[PDB]
């Protein structure tokens, strides 16, 4: 069955660039996986940041970008701010349903 893997967390500083990755256990992530990155904030607040690999939701700066690197899907964050400190889950599409990674938690110092 489909298991999604991502980093359990990444740390950083405001202004840096951090890439988060997402791999499938059934093969290469591909466009038909329509990789989504939904931001989660304390008290279970979930927000779709990017979808269809590279598509930004409304109200999302293009500092956030997504892509496919080799066989992994990636979410890159540029000019990291403090407000970005959050969990970044990867949700992949397998034909008719959604499979979620465990969520990569990104920290700033501060």
């Amino acid at each position: 069955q489909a298991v999604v893997t991502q980093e359990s967390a990444l740390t950083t500083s405001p202004g840096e660039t951090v890439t988060l990755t997402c791999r499938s256990s059934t093969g290469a992530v591909t466009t038909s996986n329509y990789a989504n990155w939904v931001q989660e904030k304390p008290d279970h607040l979930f927000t779709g940041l990017i979808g269809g690999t590279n598509n930004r939701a409304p109200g999302v700066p293009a500092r956030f970008s997504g892509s496919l690197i080799g066989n992994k899907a990636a979410l890159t964050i540029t000019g990291a701010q403090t407000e970005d400190e959050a969990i970044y889950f990867c949700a992949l599409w397998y034909s008719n349903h959604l499979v979620f990674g465990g969520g990569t938690k990104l920290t700033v110092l501060e």
Partner: protein
Amino acid sequence: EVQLQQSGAELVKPGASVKLSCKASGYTFTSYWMHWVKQRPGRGLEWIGRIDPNGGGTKYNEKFKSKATLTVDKPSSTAYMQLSSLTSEDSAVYYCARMWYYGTYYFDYWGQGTTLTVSS
């Protein structure tokens, strides 16, 4: 704005059948597809299914299909999830999220998630 609405907390006991809802500000579901994300510590987030208000068409996982369920109150604007025959591990915080992919336009907005307490 645009905001999505679920209940604070619901209490149920094993073997009982409960139902959780997801509204839109919004205005109404359908269309703007529906999700149910389950959150249980470390595990983080699980999935469940969708519903086609216009006339049915839900989809889950081999494991969900028993307890799973997805619905609406189209004459109002509600979406629904039903756990039939709950267990103590059904206990969790289930998130609702909409829209699209089907692909209306063009990102999800989360709810806050209902605390499902099971049971005492």
